[PDB]
Write an enzyme that holds these catalytic residues in place. Structure first.
Site, PDB file in Angstrom:
ATOM      1  N   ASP A 129       0.836  -1.198   0.000  1.00  0.00           N
ATOM      2  CA  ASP A 129       0.000   0.000   0.000  1.00  0.00           C
ATOM      3  C   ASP A 129       0.878   1.258   0.000  1.00  0.00           C
ATOM      4  OD1 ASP A 129      -1.952   1.951   0.457  1.00  0.00           O
ATOM      5  OD2 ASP A 129      -2.923   0.773   2.056  1.00  0.00           O
ATOM      6  N   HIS A 176       0.402   0.164  -4.763  1.00  0.00           N
ATOM      7  CA  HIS A 176      -0.780   0.885  -5.216  1.00  0.00           C
ATOM      8  C   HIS A 176      -0.842   2.285  -4.611  1.00  0.00           C
ATOM      9  CE1 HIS A 176      -3.236   0.265  -1.505  1.00  0.00           C
ATOM     10  NE2 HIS A 176      -2.841  -0.996  -1.524  1.00  0.00           N
ATOM     11  N   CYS A 178      -9.266   5.569   4.660  1.00  0.00           N
ATOM     12  CA  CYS A 178      -9.607   4.272   4.137  1.00  0.00           C
ATOM     13  C   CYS A 178     -10.781   4.515   3.113  1.00  0.00           C
ATOM     14  CB  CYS A 178     -10.028   3.326   5.292  1.00  0.00           C
ATOM     15  SG  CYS A 178     -10.820   1.743   4.664  1.00  0.00           S
ATOM     16  N   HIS A 227     -13.396   3.073   2.635  1.00  0.00           N
ATOM     17  CA  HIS A 227     -14.701   2.821   3.227  1.00  0.00           C
ATOM     18  C   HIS A 227     -14.932   3.630   4.493  1.00  0.00           C
ATOM     19  CE1 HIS A 227     -13.662  -0.887   0.871  1.00  0.00           C
ATOM     20  NE2 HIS A 227     -14.644  -0.301   0.206  1.00  0.00           N
ATOM     21  N   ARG A 236      -5.474   3.386  -7.868  1.00  0.00           N
ATOM     22  CA  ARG A 236      -6.732   3.260  -7.145  1.00  0.00           C
ATOM     23  C   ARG A 236      -7.471   4.590  -7.212  1.00  0.00           C
ATOM     24  NH1 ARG A 236      -7.626   2.131  -0.553  1.00  0.00           N
ATOM     25  NH2 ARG A 236      -8.860   4.059  -0.295  1.00  0.00           N
ATOM     26  N   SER A 263     -13.386  -6.359   0.664  1.00  0.00           N
ATOM     27  CA  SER A 263     -13.078  -5.648   1.892  1.00  0.00           C
ATOM     28  C   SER A 263     -13.852  -6.232   3.069  1.00  0.00           C
ATOM     29  CB  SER A 263     -13.415  -4.171   1.737  1.00  0.00           C
ATOM     30  OG  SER A 263     -13.187  -3.475   2.934  1.00  0.00           O
ATOM     31  N   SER A 323     -14.578  -4.376   5.377  1.00  0.00           N
ATOM     32  CA  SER A 323     -15.428  -3.237   5.723  1.00  0.00           C
ATOM     33  C   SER A 323     -16.833  -3.388   5.165  1.00  0.00           C
ATOM     34  CB  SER A 323     -14.831  -1.926   5.206  1.00  0.00           C
ATOM     35  OG  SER A 323     -13.584  -1.639   5.817  1.00  0.00           O
TER      36      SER A 323
HETATM   37 MG   LIG Z   1      -4.644   1.740   2.510  1.00  0.00          MG
END
Ligand SMILES: [Mg+2]
Ligand SMILES: O=C(O)CC[N+](=O)[O-]
Ligand SMILES: O=C(O)CC[N+](=O)[O-]
Ligand SMILES: [Mg+2]
Ligand SMILES: [Mg+2]
Ligand SMILES: [Mg+2]
Ligand SMILES: [Mg+2]
Ligand SMILES: [Mg+2]
Ligand SMILES: [Mg+2]
Ligand SMILES: [Mg+2]
Ligand SMILES: [Mg+2]
Lengths: 428, 428, 428, 428
Positions: free
Chosen positions: B154, B181, B192, B194, B229, B316, B318
Site C-alpha cells: 500500500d 498501489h 480508508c 470505506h 486506485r 473488503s 469493511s
Molecule cells: Mg490503505
C-alpha cells in the site's frame, strides 16, 4: 532552575526500604546513597512502569493467582484485556520469532537486538492506552483497568551486569511492570525447552538480579523482579568457581571449556534458595507439565522462604494431552496456585493463535475464496455476545477517537472519518 | 582498475527494453530513457527480491485465472498464507496503521504513521519467507514451489507530493516489493476507502503520482507492478477544479475549508480509470458494497477503451458480506470477478481480523477454563497437520534447525545445539 | 517460477575458491556444499558489499597503503571522500558514544543494540550515493569513486558464533566492504585502550573468524575479514582449555572464575599466527604508538606468513606528542606501510572533530554571538579552493538532485527548490 | 485499582488556565472538559517536557534573550551546554540532511519519516542526562543545568491537523520544551530560504497551532508553541478561501491550481497578528539579516500585542559578510533582543561545524597523515582551559559512570574500564 523531577534524598529512600511492606523480603547489597549517586540531578517519572508494578504486586496478593498469555502485538494485548485477563506476558521467544528489530525470524537464542522487547512493551502500552481512550469516549466501562501490568522477558541480559542494567532501564522506560532474568550464559542462551543450555555460576546470576534491582531503584519504580533457573535440564555450566555449584560439577569438560554438571530438581532448589533474597518471584523451567514435581519444588523453597511467591510456565513446548488427562488439565492452574505459583503464563500463546488462525483462513481461502472469510466474519459477529468489539474495526483502532480530536480542533470539519463510513452504515 | 559491479545501463539499452519487452506494451512514460540514467549516479544497486517478485507477479497475473491474496501484517502471517497455498501477499496500510507501524501507536487509516512503516513490513515479510525457504531446503520440503511470493503493498496517497511518492516507491523496492498501489486522495486528509470524509485530488495530480512511482522503479531498474486506485465512487470533495476532466462533476459549491463539492459515483471512477490506464498496470475502484453488477459495469466501460487493461478488486472486510449477498453469490464472487478482468483480488484486513478474533477467543476461554482452552487450540493445530500445517513444532518453524546447521557448519563439535535434547524432539 | 537470484552450484563456488587469487591464502574448515545448503532457493545480490569488498581488496594491493578516519554520520563520510580519502572507518566506539539505536551515550562495552553498526553502514552508503548522484547532475568528476569501501566494527560479535554470523550478515546487507572481530569476551568487551579486558580462547576466536567468513560466503560476497587481538594488555582469559594459550596462564583465578594471563607482544604474535589462515588482515591493539613495537610484531608474523597484510590503529586514545616528536609523527604511517600495515585508521577522529568543533563554535557564540559563527562561514568560503562544497548546504544535501526528479515528473512544476533560493541569490 | 497518573478534573484544568500567568495571553477555542475527554483514565507524566518547557518559559522572561545553535547529535548538545548555552535548537533541515530515520540524505522538504525529530529530541535529552550523571559523580558543578530546554521543528505537521497532533505528542513524549509550526503546504514544504514555497490559508494554520496546543494540554505539559510564517518570500498559496488572505491574492494561477500571492512583510504582519492569540512566540522568515526589517515587524506586531515575544532565525542560508559589516554582525543579536526577539538561533550550525571540521581534518590527513590529526588533538588540549573535557573521551561518554554502576553491583569486579586504561595513564 526547576524542581520537577528532583531526586529523593537517601534518607527518604531508606525509610521506604525500611517501612514499605513491598520491600520486606528484599535484600539489597548496595546502599541508598549508592542509588542516589547514580541519579544525576533529575529523575524521570515512569508513570506506566510505576502503575503497572504496583497493580501487579497488589494483584499477586489479592487474586488467587494472576495468569496471562504471551502477546507479541498491541492488538493481541487489547483482546487479552477485553476477554478478562489482568496481566500480559511478553515472551522473548515470540519476539525472536515474529517481532524483533532486526526484521528477521529467529530461534530463541538471544540473536535479536537488545532493545526489541522494550519496544514491544511500549507498543503494548500504547495499544492498551488507545483502547482506554476509546472506551472513555464510548462510555464503555466493561473493563476496569485497560492498563494491565506487563511482565517482560529479560532473557540472560544480553551480556554482563551492565547489559542487564540497560535492558531493565529500557523496559522501565517503556512501562514494564515486571521482568524476568535467567541463569544462562547469554552467548549460548536457549529457550528453556531447547537443548544445549549453559548455566552461569550462582553468584553471577545474583549479580544479574542485583543489577536489575539497581536499575529499578535508580529509575525509582518498584518493578517486580523475577528469577528463572534453567538447571533442571542444563548439563553445562561455564565455571566451577562458586562453591554452591561444585556439588553438581562432574569433572567432565567440553572443548569450549565448559563444565558438565548434574541436572534436575536438586540444583534448581539450591539455586532458587540462593536467588530468593533477590527475587520477587522464583521460576524453575521444567521438562513436562507435572503437578507433583511442581509441588516438590514449591515446598522445598517455601520450607526456607515461606512467603516466597513462585511463577510457572505453562509452556506450549509441552504436548499437553501426551502427559495429562483432561481432568488434570482443567485443574492444572488452580492446583499450582495452591502451591504458591501466583504468576502462570502460556508463553507462546500468541505465536500459535496467530499462525494457526491465519493458516486455517488462508487454507480455506485458497479453496473457497470469499466463503472462507465470511465464516470468520460471522464468527466475529456471533462473538459480540461474549464482548468482542473488533468486528467494527474502524472504531476499534480509534477512528472515533481521532474524529473527536478533529472536532475539538475544528468542529466544522467536513473531513471526519466515521460519518458516511460503511461501518456506520453496515455494522449494527 | 575500478570494479564494474553495479555499472548502470545505457539509455539505449533502457530504450531498447521499453520498445521490445512486452512488459511495457501498454505503458506510457512522459519522461525519457536519458532522464532515467541522469538520476542513477554511477552505481545501480541490484534489488533481487523486487525484481524477482515483480517478474513473478506479472507472469502470474497473465497465467492464472486470477491472483488472490490476504492482508499480512507480520512475517509469520505471510508464511502461513504461502504454506496454505496462496501465491501472493497483500500488505495493507490500514493494518500497518492499526498494529504494525513505526510510531508504536494504534491509528485509524488516515496516513498518521511514519512513511517508512510499510517498507519495513515488506522487508520483514521477505525475511520471514526467506527463513521458511531456508528451512524447507534443509528439511527436504518441496511442498511449496515458491516461498518468495510476490508482495503487493500500500502506497496510500504518497505522504505528500511527487517526491514523497518517489521515496516511498524507492523504499518499497529496496525492501523487495513486487507491486504497489497509489490512490487519488489528498494525503493530508487520507481515508480508508470505506471511511467518510474523503477528498480527491485532481486527475492530473494522480497521473503525476503514477508517473513518479514508475520513475522511481525505472531509476531502481526493476519492473515493479504499479496499481492505480480511485476513490471517486464515494468521495464528495475535491481539492481543486483545475482539471477539465474533473470539472463536469464539480457543482461550484465549496466547503469552509475551500474544498470543492463533486458528484460521486461510478461515472467519475470510469473517467479517472480511463485517464489512469496508460500509467497503471492494474486499476482499482473502491466501492461501497460488494456488487458483481457494479464491478461488471466498471469493467466493461474501462475495457471498451483499454481491452487489455487488468483490474483489481478489494474484497473488503469493511463490507458486511451476508447483509448484502447470499451464500451462493459469496461462493462464486471472486471467480465471477476474474472473468470480468479483475486479476488481482485481495481481502485487505484479513490479518487484523484473524489476529484479533483468535486471541479474543483464546483469551476468553482461558479466562474461564485456563489450560483447557489452550489445549483445544494445540489439538486443532495437531489436526491441521494433515493439511500441511507445521507451526505446532514451533522451534523448527522459526529456524532452530537452520541455525543448528549454521552452528555445526562453523564448529561440527558444538555441544550447544538446540534441537538435540529439546522437548520438541522428545514430545512432538 | 523465476531464475533471478538462482544460487550457484557448489562446483562453481569451489572453482572460485580454487582459482580466484582472492582466496589464495584463505582457509575454510567447511565445504562449498555446506555453503549452498544454507542459501535456500534465492540469493540476494548485495551490490555495495560486493563492489566495496572488491575495491578495498584492490586498493590494499595497489596503493602504498589505505588509510581512513572514523565516521559516525553520513555527511562525515562524504567529507572524508570529498577530501580525497579512499576508505571509511566505522568505529564501534563512536557508535556507542553518539550514534546507536538505543539513543543513549555509552562507553565502549558492547552495550548498544547489535544492529546499530549495520544501520550506520547503510547510512554512510546512502550519503555517499547521494553525493555521487549530485556529482553526476553537476558534471563533477573530481572524485573517482564516491562509494569508498567501509570497514566496520564487529566488536566481539555480541555473543556466540550465531551472533557473529547475524552481525556479519547485517553488515553485508547494509553494504560493508570489510569487518573486524576481536578475541574478547563479548559480555565484558572493552575498547582496546580501556582496562578490564578478558580474552577468549584462541580457538574460540578462530570460530568467530570462521563464522564471519561463512556469513560472507552464504551471502556470496568477498568481504574482507580482519582479526584483532587484545592480548597486549589483557591480563584475563575465560579458560585455559586451549593449549596455545596455556604458556601464558599463571594459575591464579579471579572470583569470577577468570584465569590470569601474561599479557604482552608474545601472546599477540602467537594469536596472530593462529588467526592468519582465517584473516585477510591482522591487527594487534597496542598501548602506545611505537614503530619498533610494530616492526617487532610485523616481522614475527611475516616470518611465518610473508604475504599477510596487517592493520594499525592510530588511536586518539594515545597522547601523541607525549610519546613522539614531530618528525616521527610526520613519518609514522609511511613507516608502518613499509612494514606491511596496509590499512591504517584513526578510530575516534569523528568524535573529536565533532565535539571540538561544536565546543569551539558554541564557546565563541556564548561570548560574542553572531561574530563567532561568521568566522566559521568565512573559513568555509576560504575552504572552497581546497574543494570544500558544503558552504552551499542546499545543493550539498540534494536540493538540486530532487529538483531534477521533480522536473522529470513534471517539467512545469512551479514548486522546485533552488530557483529563488537565497543560496542561488547570495552564494556565487 | 491504583491512583498513579489519575487525570485532573476539568475544574482543576480550568483554574490553571484562569490563574497561571503562563496562560494569560493564550486563546483556546476548545474547553477544559474537551481536554479531559481525550485523556483516557491515565495521564503519563512527561518529566523532561514539563521541566524543559517551564525552564524555557522562565528563561525567556529572565534573560536578556535566549540563544541556541542547531544540534543534530547528542554530543553536539552536550558541547553547546558545556560551552554555556541555555537552550538547544533542533533543526528539521539538519535532520533531513544527516539525522533521520530513512537513513537518507534529503533536502528540506518534509521527505523524512515524521517520527525522526522526536527521536533526536529523545537522543539529545539522553545525552544531556549522561553529562548530568557524569558531572554528579565527578563533583563537577560547572554547569548549573545540563537539561537545557529543547526547541524542535514541527515543520508543516506532515499532513493535516491529526498529523500535527501526533507529532506534538511524540515531541513531548521525547522531552521537548517547545515546538514550531509553519504556515506551508506540507506536501510542498520547503526550507524558508528555498524557493517554491506554498502557503496554506491563515485559518488552516490557526488550526495547526490549535492542534499543537491541544496535544500539549492532553499530555498535561505547558509546551512552548511557536508560530512561523513563510509569507515574506512565498508567492503561492493553496486557496483564496480565507478573507484575511484575499488582499494579497493577485488572480494569477499555476497549472497545479495554486494562487499567486503578493509576498513581503505586509502579509507576514497580518498573519502574525492572526496567529498571536495562539502562539507563545512568533517568527517571520526573512530573505536577509536586516535589523530594520526586523524592527518594522516587531513594532507592527507589538502595536496590537505589546507582550508578544518573537523569535529570529540567524540563518546560515544568509551570506553574512555579503550583507553586513563586522560591527553590525557583532551587535545583531543584542539589537534584536531589545526589539522583543527573545529566542534567536543559528539553525544549521551543526551541519556546518560537522562538515567543515571533517573536511579540514581529512584534507590534512590526506596530505600529511598523523601530523594533521595531532594538530586537532593539541587544539583540544588547548581548549581545556576554556572548559573543554572531551579530550578524555572515555569519561566523556561515561566510562566512569558505568564503572560506578559496576562496582555498585559488584565491588570486587575485576573487569572495570578506567583502571588500566590509556586515558588514566596518558591523559592525567
Ligand atoms: Mg490503505
Ligand atoms: O485460533 C484459532 O484456533 C483460530 C480461530 N479462528 O476462528 O480462526
Ligand atoms: O578544529 C577543527 O576541527 C575545525 C574547527 N571549525 O569547526 O572550524
Ligand atoms: Mg525467553
Ligand atoms: Mg524473595
Ligand atoms: Mg474449516
Ligand atoms: Mg495500463
Ligand atoms: Mg570497537
Ligand atoms: Mg591470512
Ligand atoms: Mg525546518
Ligand atoms: Mg501570543
Amino acid at each position: 532552575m526547576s524542581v520537577v523531577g528532583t531526586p529523593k534524598s537517601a534518607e527518604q529512600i531508606q525509610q521506604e526500604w525500611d517501612t514499605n511492606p513491598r520491600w520486606k523480603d528484599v535484600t539489597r547489597t548496595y546502599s541508598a546513597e549508592d542509588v542516589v549517586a547514580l541519579q544525576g540531578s533529575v529523575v524521570e517519572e515512569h508513570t506506566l512502569a510505576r502503575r503497572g508494578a504496583e497493580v501487579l504486586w497488589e494483584q499477586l496478593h489479592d487474586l488467587e493467582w494472576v495468569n496471562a498469555l504471551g502477546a507479541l502485538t498491541g492488538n493481541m494485548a487489547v483482546q487479552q484485556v477485553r476477554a478478562g485477563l489482568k496481566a500480559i506476558y511478553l515472551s522473548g521467544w515470540q519476539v525472536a520469532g515474529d517481532a524483533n528489530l532486526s526484521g528477521h525470524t529467529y530461534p530463541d537464542q538471544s540473536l535479536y537486538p537488545a532493545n526489541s522487547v522494550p519496544q514491544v512493551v511500549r507498543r503494548i502500552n500504547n495499544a492498551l492506552q488507545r483502547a482506554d481512550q476509546i472506551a472513555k469516549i464510548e462510555g464503555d466501562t466493561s473493563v476496569e483497568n485497560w492498563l494491565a501490568p506487563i511482565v517482560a522477558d529479560g532473557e540472560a541480559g544480553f551480556g554482563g551486569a551492565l547489559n542487564v542494567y540497560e535492558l531493565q532501564k529500557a523496559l522501565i522506560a517503556a512501562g514494564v511492570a515486571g521482568s524476568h532474568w535467567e541463569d544462562q550464559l547469554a552467548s549460548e542462551k536457549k529457550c528453556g525447552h531447547l537443548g544445549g543450555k549453559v548455566l552461569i555460576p550462582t553468584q553471577q546470576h545474583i549479580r544479574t538480579l542485583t543489577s536489575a534491582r539497581l536499575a529499578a531503584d535508580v529509575a525509582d519504580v518498584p518493578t517486580v523482579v523475577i528469577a528463572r533457573t534453567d538447571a533442571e535440564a542444563a548439563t553445562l555450566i561455564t565455571s566451577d568457581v562458586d562453591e554452591r555449584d561444585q556439588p553438581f560439577i562432574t569433572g567432565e569438560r567440553t572443548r569450549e571449556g565448559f563444565y558438565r554438571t548434574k541436572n534436575g530438581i536438586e540444583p534448581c532448589i539450591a539455586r532458587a534458595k540462593a536467588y530468593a533474597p533477590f527475587a520477587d518471584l522464583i521460576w524453575m523451567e521444567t521438562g513436562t507439565p507435572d503437578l507433583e514435581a511442581a509441588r516438590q519444588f514449591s515446598e522445598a523453597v517455601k520450607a526456607e522462604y515461606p512467603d516466597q511467591m513462585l511463577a510457572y510456565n505453562c509452556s506450549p513446548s509441552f504436548n499437553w494431552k501426551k502427559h495429562l488427562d483432561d481432568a488434570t488439565i482443567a485443574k492444572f492452574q488452580k492446583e499450582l496456585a495452591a502451591m504458591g505459583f501466583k504468576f502462570q503464563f502460556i508463553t507462546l500463546a500468541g505465536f500459535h493463535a496467530l499462525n494457526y488462525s491465519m493458516f486455517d483462513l488462508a487454507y480455506g481461502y485458497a479453496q473457497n475464496q470469499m466463503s472462507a472469510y465470511v465464516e470468520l466474519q460471522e464468527r466475529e459477529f456471533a462473538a459480540e455476545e461474549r464482548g468482542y468489539t473488533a468486528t467494527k474495526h474502524q472504531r476499534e483502532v480509534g477512528a472515533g477517537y481521532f474524529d473527536r480530536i478533529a472536532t475539538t480542533v475544528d468542529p466544522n470539519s467536513s473531513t471526519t472519518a466515521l460519518t458516511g463510513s460503511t461501518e456506520e452504515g453496515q455494522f449494527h
